[PDB]
Design a protein around this nucleic acid. Structure first.
Lengths: 102, 272, 86, 56
RNA sequence: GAACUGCAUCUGAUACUGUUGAGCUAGAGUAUGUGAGAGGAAGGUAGAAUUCCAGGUGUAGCGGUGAAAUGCGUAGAGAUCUGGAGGAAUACCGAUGGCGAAGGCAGCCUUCUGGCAUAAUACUGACACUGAGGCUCGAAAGCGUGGGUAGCAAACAGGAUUAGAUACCCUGGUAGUCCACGCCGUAAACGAUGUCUACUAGUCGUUGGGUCCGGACUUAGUGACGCAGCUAACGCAAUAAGUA
RNA sequence: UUUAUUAAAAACACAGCACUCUGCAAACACGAAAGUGGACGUAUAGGGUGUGAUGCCUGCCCGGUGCUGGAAGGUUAAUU
């Protein structure tokens, strides 16, 4: 099952935004999952403030995994507390083309 | 769950018993047991200081680990036992070194799963963590009040606490009393609500069942003579006076808390 | 659900002829597999009446095909229900 | 051809000045693509790529 | 005499019905690919807004009405700014639009899951329709138990209006509305139109497909008209209330 | 269950219901205090009060007296 997950991380943790990305990569790939796309939209300006901040780091990684690793990933996103938003969508196929936001 | 008895006797017509097939049918772990004689509600003067206590079944004390200081050594849940000393179920923990303890069992805690104590523990039911390491909004139980003393709050069956937030070295907890209060962030808590959530759905059925639990009958003040109780007296039924205890303290609405040294720990209470 | 692979496994097991996939045997076997698999869904979702409507229709269709097959050839019907535990 | 929620620059000309979705009787879009556009706009609003209203 | 439409038993016929053997694919289904959808169930989450709590600014009104008054406010309201709590609903999109057997179903995401629509090929070979009883589901209100409780609001309290006003209007306000699990089994539960077939001028929209050359044809819906026909009339008219 | 020894009951208790208190060194109770009971319990717990299985239910009144909250103003102790 292919999933497209967009993470929305605090600007105060943009330095560790890379480390958490590789941690999630390792978790996905250690469960025989595939990581098809990994972009980094950088410090985007929010259209409305989230938790009092106006700028935040966007990272979209189109991964391919199973339900159990998806649950593990979702719990990690819930408990990270550096991620202020997460959008996990399901895709019928795998997307590798460069997105319009990068 | 709750099982009604058939009305095959008038003393059975309203018995609704709490039934748990999944809890141990055998005897408790003998090394964690202490003798405990009944008190009759009498203090060291031999005086009744707490009324309606007496009789009931002999029961041992199960030594409960309320402190959970075997940190970083995993334990497996050997069994879930009935405890006559509380309304919650207890879990026999078997540590990696082989030491066995009893803890309060969480609702989502089954035989076989692994529990952890310390600060680097997963947020799973039965794990004991300092309140600074528990994410906000997690449902917790067995709250420590003084650092290192052991759990005192949210221990009864079904007991849960909302971990609302933080201000400095304090965690803000909403208790099931409708009370929001501060607790030091170094105090510990256990993840999840407490087992035996349907404890309060039970119906004893008959007077003898209350006697089995060591409770003596209760005689209303209005049924006495005035020499026994402020409500005593009267030709026929009559109250006459504002409701009050036998010692003359009013019992409808009058507040009785008097503790200034802890008054700063309490954010607020709820109104309903 | 049932995957394409296990659906084809059931089809192959109950083929009366080559790649028929339409006889009462294969139809009843596929319906039986789908019902036994949907039991898992309806044990966790008891109030799913809109899905239960379709499952009941599956049961009705299997009953119609079993009665038709019994009236057609009784040996085939008694063999099929013995294989499927019905 | 196709429409996604990461086409924010495309979604801008289908959102109003105050963040409201513009109706089909104005834009002229088909029912199917209008449904997809509404879904993508709602997703972008969640991801804070577009504003819900113009006064948050 | 005729009749006694009747019954019985033999004989003959096989068009139809009944019972049977074999075969067929056009009704009904299966496998395979795509597609649309507020279909259902369980979780999570977002943003606007209300209410409340606590502060800053500030001062004499606010609120409400046809006018008023009750109410709130000098113990500092209302307004404005900043924080916090909580519940409920999901603006725009939005559409005689869609999905569902009806009842119904709208933020977004995931998980489980039903039906439908569509192309071609292969397959089964009448497996069909309807259906007394029976069962299932079934708005809202209501009921039981346990939660929750912002807004709204039966009851209720007050203020008006009035001859009166157990109302309409105003200020409040509890059940209920929300959740879980069970009842209840009723609605102008309506298209006041049972289900399923086939056939019968046409014209213009629209939703989901398909095939051709921006159009044309065809499909399953969903609408507006309009012949024949039908109707007491109104009207219905391929989504019949026509012909069976 | 009860008036041992003139009253056994419709009285008391009772399972159940409700209100209210109590965040733990709990409230509450014994005690001069230490020390205790509550309880090696922890708000699904513990105390007080009323009512008394269950079924259907439980209307109106906050003027009085209590209780809860509030503090603008009036009055007000020792002290100075």
């Amino acid at each position: 099952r292919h999933y497209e997950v967009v993470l929305l991380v605090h600007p105060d943790q943009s330095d560790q935004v890379v480390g958490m990305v590789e941690r999630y990569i390792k978790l996905v790939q250690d469960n025989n999952g595939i990581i098809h796309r990994l972009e980094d939209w950088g410090r985007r300006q929010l259209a409305y403030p989230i938790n009092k901040i106006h700028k935040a780091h966007y990272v979209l990684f189109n991964i391919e995994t199973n339900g159990e690793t998806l649950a593990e990933l979702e719990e990690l996103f819930r408990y990270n507390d550096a991620i202020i938003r997460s959008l996990v969508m399901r895709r019928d196929d795998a997307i590798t083309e460069e997105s319009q936001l990068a | 769950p709750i099982v009604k008895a058939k009305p095959t006797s008038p003393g059975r017509r309203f018995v609704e018993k709490v039934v748990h097939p999944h809890l141990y049918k055998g005897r408790p772990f003998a090394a964690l047991l202490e003798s405990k004689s009944k008190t009759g509600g009498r203090n060291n003067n031999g005086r009744i200081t707490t009324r309606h206590i007496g009789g009931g079944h002999k029961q041992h004390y199960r030594i409960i680990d309320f402190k959970r200081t075997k940190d970083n050594i995993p334990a497996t849940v050997e069994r879930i036992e009935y405890d006559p000393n509380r309304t919650a179920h207890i879990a026999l923990l078997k540590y990696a070194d082989g030491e066995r303890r009893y803890i309060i069992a969480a609702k989502k805690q089954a035989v076989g799963d692994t529990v952890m104590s310390g600060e680097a523990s997963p947020i799973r039911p039965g794990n004991c963590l300092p309140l600074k390491n528990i994410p906000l909004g997690t449902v917790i139980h067995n709250i420590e009040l003084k650092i290192g003393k052991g759990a005192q709050m949210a221990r009864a069956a079904g007991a849960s606490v909302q971990l609302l937030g933080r201000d400095g070295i304090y965690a803000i907890l909403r208790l099931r009393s409708g009370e929001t209060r501060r607790v030091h962030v170094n105090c510990r808590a256990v993840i999840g609500e407490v087992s035996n959530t349907e404890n309060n759905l039970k119906s004893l059925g008959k007077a003898g069942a209350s006697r089995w639990r060591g409770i003596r009958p209760s005689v209303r003040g209005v049924a006495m003579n005035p020499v026994d109780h402020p409500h005593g007296g009267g030709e026929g039924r009559n109250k006459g006076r504002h409701p009050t205890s036998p010692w003359g303290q009013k019992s409808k609405g009058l507040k009785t808390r008097h503790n200034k040294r802890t008054d700063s720990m309490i954010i607020r209470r709820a109104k309903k | 659900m049932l995957t394409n692979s296990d659906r084809e496994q059931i089809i192959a097991q109950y083929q009366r002829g080559e790649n028929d996939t339409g006889s009462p045997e294969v139809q009843v076997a596929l319906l039986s597999a789908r019902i036994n698999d949907l039991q898992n869904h309806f044990k966790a979702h008891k109030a799913d009446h809109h899905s239960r409507r379709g499952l009941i229709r599956m049961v009705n269709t299997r009953r119609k095909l079993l009665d038709y097959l019994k009236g057609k050839d009784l040996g085939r019907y008694t063999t099929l229900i013995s294989q499927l535990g019905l | 051809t196709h429409i996604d929620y990461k086409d924010v620059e495309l979604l801008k000309q289908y959102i109003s000045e105050n963040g409201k979705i513009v109706p089909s009787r104005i834009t002229g879009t088909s029912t199917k693509y209008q449904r997809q556009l509404a879904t993508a706009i709602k997703q972008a609003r969640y991801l804070s790529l577009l504003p819900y209203t113009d006064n948050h």
